[PDB]
């Protein structure tokens, strides 16, 4: 079946999901990654502009999702 994972995710030899950062196209090295609150994609910190971990209580959206959101001037 072609249904594997057409996304930035692969499995290792044991069968764990290894997320690939769509930012650099590099896999996870056991690195701190941030998941978007919309697409749930997994990017590395230096790839999106994160340097310290924000809480799950605070939302964050990647350059993918935050762009469609736009974060318009009107608030």
């Amino acid at each position: 079946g072609s249904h594997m994972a057409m996304a930035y995710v692969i499995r290792d030899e044991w069968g764990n999901q290894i997320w690939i950062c769509p930012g650099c196209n590099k896999p996870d090295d056991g690195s701190p990654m941030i998941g978007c609150d919309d697409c749930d994609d997994w990017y590395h910190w230096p790839c999106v502009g994160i340097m310290a971990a924000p809480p799950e209580e605070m939302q964050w959206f990647c350059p993918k999702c935050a762009n469609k959101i736009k974060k318009d001037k009107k608030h």
Binding site: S31, P32, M33
Partner: peptide, 13 residues
């Protein structure tokens, strides 16, 4: 903002 490190060894966390 789900932040986690897939680590079996991390310094601090």
């Amino acid at each position: 903002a789900r932040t986690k490190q897939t680590a079996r060894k991390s310094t601090g966390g």
